[PDB]
Design a protein around this ligand. Structure first.
Ligand SMILES: O=C(O)c1c(F)ccc2c1O[B-](O)(O)[C@@H]1C[C@H]21
Ligand SMILES: [Zn+2]
Ligand SMILES: [Zn+2]
Length: 229
């Protein structure tokens, strides 16, 4: 099920959806896997999250060229940390239109990231303002509230059973909520639950640092976050 491609791993999750995985050896954490998504929509490819680095992100684009061979119409990144946004320059070098939460773009320089070219804004109920996410096809972008970070966003894939929680969601057996350095501890549980409520049909939950899981990832993440209050 896993395809090794250079130093990256790709896993098909649905007829039109693949998970990309890249690794960074970070001092104190080991070699951390980070996951994003690749979605074919008709004659276009859409990407969710970069790899950790520009070089790894260029390798994602190389895999897409070899395995799908359709243009990458856009990428959306899910917050301003390196696992999600470290490869922005590779997307720009490739001519790909890039999107992030407006707040992610504002935070990018101080986080050591390069901003995306376009900013998403969100209605009070969390759904993206559609004018700011043109041509997103089946990608349904939802801001669940502050959690792992204040700017974290999530993405469902219409027509599939898949939703992507990024670094907000940890797997159903996780022992901790990971890196809480920029987290909103009081609102985390509610934000995890809001993600689940936004995508009630999603039976496959994809996340940054573990393999795809059932919705027990959502309930378990929220239950762990209940203890932060
Ligand atoms: O998502 C996490 O919880 C996480 C972690 F547990 C360890 C290290 C990192 C994490 O994500 B990050 O904050 O986005 C960043 C790349 C670093
Ligand atoms: Zn993060
Ligand atoms: Zn992370």
């Amino acid at each position: 099920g896993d395809q090794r491609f250079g130093d990256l791993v790709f896993r098909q999750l649905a007829p039109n959806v693949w998970q990309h995985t890249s690794y960074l050896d970070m001092p104190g954490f080991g070699a951390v896997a980070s996951n994003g998504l690749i979605v074919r929509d008709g004659g276009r490819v859409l990407v969710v999250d970069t790899a950790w680095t520009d070089d790894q992100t260029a390798q994602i684009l190389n895999w897409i060229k070899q395995e799908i061979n359709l243009p990458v119409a856009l990428a959306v990144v899910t917050h301003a940390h390196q696992d999600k946004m470290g490869g922005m320059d590779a997307l720009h070098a490739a001519g790909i239109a890039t999107y992030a939460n407006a707040l992610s773009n504002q935070l990018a320089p101080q986080e050591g990231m390069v901003a995306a070219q376009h900013s998403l804004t969100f209605a009070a109920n969390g759904w993206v303002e559609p004018a700011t996410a043109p041509n997103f096809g089946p990608l349904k972008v939802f801001y669940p509230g502050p959690g792992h970070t204040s700017d974290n966003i999530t993405v469902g894939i219409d027509g599939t059973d898949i939703a992507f929680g990024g670094c907000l969601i940890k797997d159903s057996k996780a022992k901790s909520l990971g890196n809480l350095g920029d987290a909103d501890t009081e609102h985390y549980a509610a934000s995890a639950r809001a993600f689940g409520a936004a995508f009630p049909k999603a039976s496959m939950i994809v996340m940054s640092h573990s393999a795809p899981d059932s919705r027990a990832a959502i309930t378990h993440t929220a239950r762990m976050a209940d203890k932060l209050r």
